[PDB]
């Protein structure tokens, strides 16, 4: 236990700042780090305390940041009583005695502009809200029961009201040998309460009994699943919503509704010889009929249901929305097909997948607040396609396209190509696109109104990392938005690694915020150095992946 090497950086938000670590072993499995952070523009010292523990309940990390005073928060907020800043973070995860599960994910800030001002270690400036979760569960092989508490704090100053589950109880029971049928049951009891006092609160009790018959062969499979959904709502604090909306929520809502689903998966093979001998191509059709009756949910507030994104494996879901408030009607068939190419060692080299949903009736739920650019209701409306090609042991490419006929445009698309020799040598190109029609559909009205959200997503990203002489590592990343012809992110990093020490110099220019006065984006720079000690262990890495995680758009490996 002692002082580490103090280390400095220069940002445009804090000007020149430095860290002075001190490390402490309380007892082995418990350590702590107390770090003064002197920042010059804010003109004070933030005290950053980390405390990591390992116990029988699991492994956890606690973080406490305290800035006693702020000149800048006194400048752009003169009317507040104090300019103090604080962060509290708690991440706990563990399984005790193989049946008890404890998970804590807690993050509370003093002010909604915290992560735009300070360092991004356990949060990010990209984050729009902070999470506060507790969950305790008991899980054995045929039964699980989890109680949880989910509270969120929203950073955006348009509407800070967000609902919370205080508490939520989930019960699952399974029994897979009732004749030829497999049965399961899922129950949920959840109390929804909002931060504002004029917004209506609820208590949901849900039961879901389910039977299914699976049959399988060497070449195909079929699965028939029958399901009930019983839901009781008790809704209170209903006066303010009913005083200003045309439709009326009721205080006691019963919703009992079936679900019938037939799934069928079909497999063909072929020995393909025109590419190479021994290669095998499998063609896999898949079909699905789903029928869900229509019940009117206009008398139910939307607390925890959001519209689900429909990829190729997301085509075959039995739920249009997540959660349990909005369950859309279904009279649909989903048809998809997947071609796979295996090599002579039965290792999968290529796959391509393309599918569609045909709707016989309109998927309606009682209220239709999502807008569409045309009135297409039935027919082939949603198309999806995925691809993955492993070109060699070093190359790989992924692709995904999602088209909606109701948007009259491709909804989302992504692609990536990656060359990778080892841990240290890599090039990756990636592309992301989301249409502004789908932004107008699945996101609320000020996103389609305000200029920083209404253009959709079209970014090209280039990541590279290269060593020199097995002691220098150079890392670069460039993410660029092609709609505005403006950059989103830049990152550079040069690290010299020796036998007992390592020096890392990092640079990042990032999108951080938006200026509401002059209507343009806000960029911040950061140049910094880190010195760490080697030789105490077998860590002879060049630090490439620790530099690849250091920006607001991280590296992930796509082979």
């Amino acid at each position: 236990s002692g002082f580490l090497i103090p280390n400095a950086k220069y940002t445009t938000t804090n000007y020149f700042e430095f860290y002075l670590p001190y490390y402490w072993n309380i007892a082995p499995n418990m350590d702590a780090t107390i770090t003064p952070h002197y920042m010059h523009r804010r003109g004070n010292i933030m005290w950053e305390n980390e405390f990591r523990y390992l116990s029988q309940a699991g492994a956890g990390l606690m973080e406490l940041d305290y800035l006693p005073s702020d000149k800048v928060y006194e400048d752009e907020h003169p009317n507040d009583d104090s300019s103090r800043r604080w962060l509290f973070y708690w991440n706990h995860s563990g399984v005790m005695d193989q049946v008890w599960r404890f998970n804590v994910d807690y993050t509370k800030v003093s002010d909604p502009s915290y992560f735009n001002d300070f360092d991004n270690k356990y949060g990010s400036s990209t984050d729009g809200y902070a999470t506060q979760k507790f969950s305790v569960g008991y899980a054995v092989q045929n039964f699980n029961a989890t109680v949880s508490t989910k509270q969120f704090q929203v950073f955006s100053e348009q509407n800070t009201s967000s609902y919370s589950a205080e508490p939520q109880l989930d019960v699952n029971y399974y029994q897979n040998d009732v004749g030829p049928f497999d049965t399961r049951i899922y129950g949920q009891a959840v109390h929804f309460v909002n931060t504002r006092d004029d917004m209506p609160e609820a208590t949901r009790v849900h039961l879901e009994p389910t039977i299914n018959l699976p049959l399988s062969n060497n070449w195909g499979s079929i699965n028939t699943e029958a399901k009930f959904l019983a839901t009781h709502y008790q809704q209170t604090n209903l006066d303010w919503y009913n005083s200003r909306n045309t439709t009326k929520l009721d205080e006691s809502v019963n919703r009992v509704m079936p679900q019938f689903k037939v799934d069928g998966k079909m497999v063909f093979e072929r020995d393909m010889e025109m590419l190479a001998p021994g290669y095998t191509q499998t063609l896999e059709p898949r079909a699905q009929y789903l029928y869900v009756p229509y019940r009117d949910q206009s008398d139910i507030y939307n607390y925890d249901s959001s519209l689900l994104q429909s990829d190729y494996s997301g085509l075959f879901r039995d739920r249009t929305y997540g959660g349990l408030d909005r369950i859309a009607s279904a009279n649909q068939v989903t048809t998809g097909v997947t071609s796979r190419i295996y090599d002579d060692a039965a290792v999968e080299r290529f796959n391509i997948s393309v599918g569609q949903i045909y709707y016989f009736t309109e998927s309606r739920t009682g209220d239709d607040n999502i807008t569409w650019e045309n009135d297409d209701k039935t027919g082939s409306l949603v198309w999806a396609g995925d691809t993955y090609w492993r070109i060699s042991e070093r190359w790989g490419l992924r692709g995904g396209i999602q088209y909606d006929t109701r948007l009259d445009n491709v909804a989302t698309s992504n692609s990536s190509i990656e060359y990778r020799r080892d841990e240290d040598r890599l090039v990756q190109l990636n592309y992301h696109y989301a249409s502004p029609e789908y932004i107008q559909a699945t996101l609320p009205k000020y996103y389609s109104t305000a200029e920083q959200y209404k253009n959709g997503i079209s970014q090209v990203g280039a990541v590279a990392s290269r060593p020199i002489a097995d002691r220098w590592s150079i890392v670069g990343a460039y993410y660029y938005d092609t709609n505005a012809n403006k950059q989103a992110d830049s990152m550079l990093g040069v690290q010299y690694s020796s036998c007992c020490y390592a020096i890392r110099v990092g640079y990042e220019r990032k999108l951080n915020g938006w200026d509401n006065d002059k209507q343009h984006a806000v960029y911040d720079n950061a140049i910094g150095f880190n010195i760490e000690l080697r030789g105490l262990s077998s860590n002879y890495g060049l630090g490439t992946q620790e530099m690849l995680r250091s920006n607001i758009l991280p590296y992930q490996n796509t082979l």
Partner: peptide, 17 residues
């Protein structure tokens, strides 16, 4: 009034209470 639990579809509220 006019509640459904089985596979019959719900209908619109301006003709039924």
């Amino acid at each position: 009034a006019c509640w459904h639990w089985w596979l019959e579809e719900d209908c619109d509220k301006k003709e039924c209470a």
